[PDB]
Design a protein around this ligand. Structure first.
Ligand SMILES: CC(C)(COP(=O)(O)OP(=O)(O)OC[C@H]1O[C@@H](n2cnc3c(N)ncnc32)[C@H](O)[C@@H]1OP(=O)(O)O)[C@@H](O)C(=O)NCCC(=O)NCCSCCCC[C@H](NC(=O)CNC(=O)Cc1ccccc1)C(=O)O
Length: 160
């Protein structure tokens, strides 16, 4: 469907902060955040990151992403990837990741995009696989209940 993108704005914060539907979803897209998510937590992430971007369809903000890490000439890492629940499965994240890949290439001369995905997040793992990301390593992490989870580190070459 028809999608556009632009930098995130203050008026987008309340909608975007509403995207994660439970503690698990919040952990998957922003593991340092604390449930419940809030506009203050989102604004703080935006201020300390780069490239915060929204995807819009039919006047609705449906998706958000930024760079978790950025290293000129080297790589960027995708951060805070989240989509409105009613709009999932429709290509919003696919679209926005394409946008972020282009931004990494153009703004950071990145050769590689990194994406890390928690093991329980099948939807994420499958999407990133469809976009050409390959798994490289697995790291142990802990969820908010102190349970041990596996963070799967994936990457993809970008090219000029
Ligand atoms: C986005 C979403 C997954 C997808 O958005 P879509 O808009 O919905 O995606 P389409 O573009 O439509 O494409 C979807 C594709 O997948 C196929 N599909 C399969 N199953 C499906 C299903 N059930 N449903 C739908 N689709 C399913 C489907 O067929 C299609 O493939 P084809 O049909 O096209 O082939 C959507 O469902 C979402 O928002 N989920 C909730 C949030 C979320 O999980 N976000 C991803 C985060 S991974 C990124 C995490 C970045 C994390 C980062 N930190 C790090 O990296 C590392 N720091 C740390 O660890 C620090 C730390 C601190 C404390 C303690 C431990 C550690 C950061 O802090 O920011």
């Amino acid at each position: 469907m028809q999608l556009s993108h632009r930098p995130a704005e203050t008026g987008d914060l309340e909608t975007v902060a509403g995207f994660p539907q439970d503690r698990d979803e919040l952990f998957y897209c922003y593991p340092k955040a604390i449930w419940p998510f809030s506009v203050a937590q989102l604004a703080a992430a935006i201020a300390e990151r780069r490239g915060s971007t929204v995807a819009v369809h039919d006047g609705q903000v449906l998706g958000f992403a930024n760079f978790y890490q950025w290293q000129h000439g080297d790589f960027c890492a995708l951060g805070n990837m989240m989509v409105a629940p009613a709009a999932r499965g429709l290509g919003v994240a696919r679209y926005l990741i394409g946008v972020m890949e282009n931004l990494a290439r153009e703004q950071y001369k990145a050769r590689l995009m990194k994406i890390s995905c928690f093991n329980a997040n099948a939807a994420g793992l499958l999407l990133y696989t469809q976009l050409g990301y390959q798994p490289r390593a697995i790291a142990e992490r802990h969820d908010p209940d102190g349970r041990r989870v596996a963070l799967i580190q994936m990457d993809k070459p970008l090219e000029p």
